[PDB]
Amino acid sequence: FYTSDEALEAATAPLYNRAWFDYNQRSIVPIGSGRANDMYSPWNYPQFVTFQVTALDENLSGAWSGFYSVVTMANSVINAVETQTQSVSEAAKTKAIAEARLMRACAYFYMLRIWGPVILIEDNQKLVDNPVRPLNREEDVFQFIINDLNYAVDNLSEQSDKGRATSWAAKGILAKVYLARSGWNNGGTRDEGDLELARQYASDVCENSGLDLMTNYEDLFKYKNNNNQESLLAMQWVPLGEWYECNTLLSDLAFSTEVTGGVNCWSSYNGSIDMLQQYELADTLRRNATFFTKGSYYSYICIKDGGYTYKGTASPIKKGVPGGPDDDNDGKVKQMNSPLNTYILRLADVYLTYAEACLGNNSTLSDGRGLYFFNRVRERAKINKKSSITLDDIIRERRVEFGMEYSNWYDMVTWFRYLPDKMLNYFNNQWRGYRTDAIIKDEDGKLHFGKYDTDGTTFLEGPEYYTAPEFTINIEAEDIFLPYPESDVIQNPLLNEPPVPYTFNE
Ligand SMILES: [Cl-]
Ligand SMILES: [Cl-]
Ligand SMILES: [Mg+2]
Ligand SMILES: [Mg+2]
């Protein structure tokens, strides 16, 4: 019985944390980043990188559970607005429905780029009464997402409490959705109507929001800057709160207690050879903020010991590894407990989305505001602007802008649905599963890949010294979308049957 706007807001707050917990607690890493080849470990979920995932994989069931937790929580909030409010304003009621529908849209948009067809649900009771329900078609899922985002665009405000969604966030996601739909199973061209809509929504955010990119890329990934102006939407973790409200990734991302102030950790992930090669030589700011590499210095990690220099010869994760409790983290670093929010949408994504929507079906983009906003991302990274861009420039730029943010894989699926032959060739040329013992730098700061001789000091350079994977799979169309989780298929055999049309309620 919610009797004030603030009481209702307390009920919608878990849409930003608890709802996402089953996904964030584990599977976000191998699905969003691993599968894109952002990083690799031979012991932690390598199958996601090498395309050898089985239906029994715990990450599939966890992700499925997490995304459906968002959907069903959203549905519960919408129901509560309509049945449990008694002095509550229409502004607050519509804001709550809008936040619920925004999150539901985000969950379905992730699922669409993991499994493809999924079950669309607006009535939780229908699911309870009969859980054996059919999949709906990819086109239905797109329309459902669009409808939810339309409501959020119309019913969120331009400004919000810090950490809460605005209409700019909804418009930014909607731009991404239209861009993703434009080429999806569309014979190698992008629908001009969807391109136009993507441009309209993205340009509105870029030109009119009054928001800007943070001056320093590294600042985006520090806890003191949670909910900075570039953060359009993020999971809002509560490190001093309940277990289901915490960001539990700290120990799985951090490679050594030397970068956690002594807090227990166990990561064996390293940035992939392919991913590391995406950073242009001049792009050291984004590279350093994403992965540690030999000799890189961090003034803001191990602050009490004058900063931190990585002295290993691998490429462990930096993004998501905020240092120890006293590294401007207000004591909020503990085992499996990170103070960082998890980004869902940054303004730089909208900039790059606008650029890609301006490129459209042309082979190059050499003028216009889309190119300007692409070049703002370059400028913020302190590297050269480009006088013209192609889709290949956009692919590279997105990988380096969003490395270790658990987003690159979803973008790669979108591209595969547009240009499947190009992207299968791309995936097969990423050297997935290859890793190497030693990555070092020369005088000019360029990375070199190889291993040490028996003496552990004499560097041997080149691919002949890489560690090859046990198996290199030829990646094909059938490999891209993941299988439905086996336990869920047992409970609902229609997950093995064709999708059917959704009956829309609007
Ligand atoms: Cl796979
Ligand atoms: Cl510390
Ligand atoms: Mg279509
Ligand atoms: Mg095969």
UniProtKB/Swiss-Prot annotation:
**Organism the protein comes from:** Bacteroides ovatus (strain ATCC 8483 / DSM 1896 / JCM 5824 / BCRC 10623 / CCUG 4943 / NCTC 11153)
Listed GO cellular component terms? cell outer membrane
Question: Keyword Membrane: yes or no?
Answer: yes
Asked if the keyword Iron belongs to this entry, the reply reads: no
Q: Which domain of life is it from?
A: Bacteria
Which InterPro entries does the annotation name?
SusD-like_N (IPR033985), SusD_RagB_dom (IPR012944), TPR-like_helical_dom_sf (IPR011990)
Metabolic or biological pathway, per its Swiss-Prot or TrEMBL entry: Glucan metabolism; xyloglucan degradation
Q: What is the name of this protein? A: SusD-like protein BACOVA_02651
* BP terms from Gene Ontology: symbiotic process benefiting host; xyloglucan catabolic process
Further comment: Gut bacteria supply the human body with energy from dietary polysaccharides through glycosidases that are absent in the human genome. Xyloglucans are a ubiquitous family of highly branched plant cell wall polysaccharides present in the vegetables we consume. Enzymes involved in xyloglucan degradation mediate the conversion of otherwise indigestible plant polysaccharides to short-chain fatty acids.
- Disulphide bonds annotated for this chain are none
